[model samples]
Target: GHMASMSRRRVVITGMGMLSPLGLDVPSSWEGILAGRSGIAPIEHMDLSAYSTRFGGSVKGFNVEEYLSAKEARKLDLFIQYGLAASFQAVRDSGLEVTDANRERIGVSMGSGIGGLTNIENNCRSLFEQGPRRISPFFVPGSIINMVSGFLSIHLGLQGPNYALTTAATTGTHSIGMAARNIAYGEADVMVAGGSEMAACGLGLGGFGAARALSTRNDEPTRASRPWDRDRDGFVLSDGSGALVLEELEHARARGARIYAELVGFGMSGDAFHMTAPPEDGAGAARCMKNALRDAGLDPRQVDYINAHGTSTPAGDIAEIAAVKSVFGEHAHALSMSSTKSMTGHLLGAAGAVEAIFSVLALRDQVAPPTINLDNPDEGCDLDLVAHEAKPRKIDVALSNSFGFGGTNGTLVFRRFAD
Candidate 1:
């Protein structure tokens, strides 16, 4: 309890990287995001012409082999490989080498909502048609959800609290929040935290289509994912990953690392409501936001920006916006919140982490990301949605949100680091 005598434990973001439909790297992707570019387009990976959801925000021109060798790519599934690439970029950007001395103090907490559907489907088809001889030895490792952390742990020789999240859309927020605690508690000196998702497969699309979740905008694929607008049909599926290198404040200072911002709070709650829908009261979501503020020891007015969980769904968007209002009240109207998913589509498990990266960068650059495609806005969600383009704002503290199926809600707050 000696550490408890101290004030809040500070955790800072030292580096970030992501691969989205916008681009394969952070600068290119964020540039596309700032320009309000639409990454959603006609589905290319499958014969989606037969499926109801024909359009999606698919990651284009990502030659994974460029980051990982052919042999390395073949062994891991798409999500694991994507995470590895994003993490490689983030760790390299931070200039952190997992040396023998620090390897034991470094860890990874990456997640994927849908783990390698392509590999699972392909392997199963081969087994059913061509018998045991056709099944390859790499099937299990490639399909498992934990391989993202497993491969990276071995790749960089990290021995700290290695873990992964599999909680649908909540995976990314859960991953980042959970990893931040590791540093806060002195369990790890530095932690690589984020989420990745690639569900461009029959199982992923078919399942979502069956749920009437994916949009049938075969004619207008690019305009399918219209978030916070009345015409929003549903969320357009997306594929990608976002990685953040989290370091204990002292650990980062000792190495003279470039710290982005400090992760101040993490709040979590469950709706205890429907499986795929949020409670109309939004108590669960609101409580999480309030809890995050309390955890950060800040007032509502102190937060300058929010990256929302506005997935463009009819019910979910309303619930999320209401939660924001319930938490921030009058300040909500003036708040510069945005849904970057309007540009990147919905990255599912990776959405929160990607938005967190956007939030931290927003603080560092004093710019607010926009919620594109918000034409016919809902009457109640009238907060500053950052409208069409990125806005220049004086930001000190920011919030990022993620709400998932089974009613899991999560929110995180980050503030500028001084010392």
Candidate 2:
């Protein structure tokens, strides 16, 4: 049977999962999210004394041994290993089987913004101390970012389209978009997509410090990531991954998979402007939002919530607000927009995917996650930022936006389903 004969159609989300600093399962993560808890703390995995900033968002009690065999888990760094286990969990929730019959038509689209920096650093030390021959054979395989999807495909026998989107903070957002596009365009029936990242190392801190893109609030790590606040510094760097199972609507319906949400809009754009910093006006982000609205056959007013790309950087919050206003106009204040990063810090590439999952929950349960740590408001950003508390409201449509280094941006929108 020709794949195209079925028509490239709507993409629906069947399942979602995460491995992050907050919690393992979506249930506990959502609990932490609503409670306005901050996961930022001092680095304990290694001595970060050499770096200016000594804080990051590291998952506590994430025992990889519970998810995989010790030998297999130890071969890959924490992030890649965590991502692989998480992908399996999502597939299990999806209820869409890629068995011997349909394995060829399945796809794997996953990525990482910063892959295995800890591995690179540790392996380099071993190489210098014990000479070149001491390097572990798993170094290259584990350190490569795309191996998240590679391992996922091999584990599940999915052999359709294999791709990854590694656009820094936009990596997860773009991965999800690419996955949905593949299903929508008849390229694949399923695309297990998202992003993972692990760069919480000396170079990670040093690189962000060199760019002055990180918060230096070592004493007040929890309050450091104050997005949209008047006293905002730079973003606090964090690491994690979030995956979603995207299947063609008809395919999912036929298989009787429990649908989480419908992926109605995917808007992507590039600033063509800067490498690390975003444009002041956020014209590109505005275009992306407008594109998504139009693609969904929706007006801007229909979007009731926005999962902001608020990195706690002084410029980033303002830039995202400007984009919202430009795209939403008088209806901007009508929407509930918030930066959950205030709770989880900046998850680099994983931000968009994690926040996208939050958006789905918002539409599902009719509430918006709060943007904590916004006591002192920035005069530039006066919109309703869900201001430190969740709200019970009908969020029929929600959007998630991610803008990364090199001026790349992606936007995704989901709508409430009624049978």
Candidate 3:
């Protein structure tokens, strides 16, 4: 007990990087949110006419050469490029100098739920049609999931712990949580953690669409992602990334770094119920929220807002609401809860980290991003979904929930920094 307490440290977010359908960087993406714009549209990169779902929240106009030279960009897959781009922005925003003196004390914890699928599929086609020898020599390096962390460490000179986690949709929040524990336990002074996914390819679309998990409102892609709406069908596929630079509180204060928010609590739970479906009663998710509050030493009433994991799916949206109501009770109604996925579609592995950043922005600006296309709210989703427009309000504490296939769930709690 004494050893653990003595080793304990506090973690704060110092910088953020985002690459979503709305925009390329953090500022532009946030502006898209405040303006209540939808990033989903008809598939433009590839022909989706044969697929049932003909649209997605694809990262538009991504120029990898801006971050890396053409030769270097050609050697890596698109997912790796997205992760590197977001992390570059985060490191630049945080202004954390990775010198020989301090490089060893930093670490990286970033990953994707599904990595390099497009490159792998292309290589497979080459193997089947031309020959095995036709496969690009860079195929192995480009398609592996862990290469994102490996490349990040090589680029930033970070030598501490390098983790490339894959926790379905909860990958980003789980990686961030584990990175915070690394800092809290005195393993590292700083960590770059998040998740990215570039899975808008044929396999990604065909697999999810086969599972009946993709929205098919091809005629109106903009209004397709309607979380908590009665007529909603399924989630829209998306490709993007989100990242954060987390630093120990004392280390940040010593270097005079800007603190975004204190990462007060992290919680994890497993449904142990089903593979693709959450429990009808939302027991596991409710427990996850309770555990987060307990870790933060906070009451339900203290929470000012909740960035829901409402993925525009019928069951997923209502299940999360029931979980919130169970944990927060009447206070749940008072708290402003909305799903920004209504705008950005679903970033899958990137959703947790991306939504987590939105929660931080809500704290900084005292505003909640809107949940658009919610013309008719589902029965239990009666809480202020902050529909159609952003709301400016005081928010001291906020929480973000992320759940994924195989019944994995994670919650992160953030509070305004106090002395």
TM-score of each: 0.97, 0.96, 0.97
How many clashes does the backbone of model 3 have?
A: 0
In the range 185-213, model 3's lDDT, one tens digit per residue, is 88899999998999988899999999999
Ranking by TM-score: 3, 1, 2
lDDT of 1 by residue, 1-419 (tens): 21223334578899998999899888898888888898988777778667888778788887878678899788788888888888888898887877888989999999999888999888889989998789879999987888889988987899999999988888989899889888888789899999999898889889999999877777977777777798888888999999999998888898999999998888889989889878876888899888788877788888899888888898888888888888888888777989898889889988887888988888888899888888889878678888888899889999998889888888989889886
lDDT at residue 254 of model 3 (Cα atoms):
90
Could you give the candidate ranking by lDDT, starting with the highest? 3, 1, 2
Give all candidates' CA lDDT scores.
0.86, 0.85, 0.89
Better of 1 and 2 by lDDT: 1
Instruction: Quote the RMSD, in angstroms, for model 2.
Output: 2.6
Candidate topping lDDT: 3
lDDT tens per residue, model 2, 106-168 = 888778888888899889999999987998999999888888888888878999899777888
Question: Higher lDDT: candidate 1 or 3?
Answer: 3
The candidate scoring highest on TM-score is 3
**CA RMSD for every model?**
1.8, 2.6, 1.7
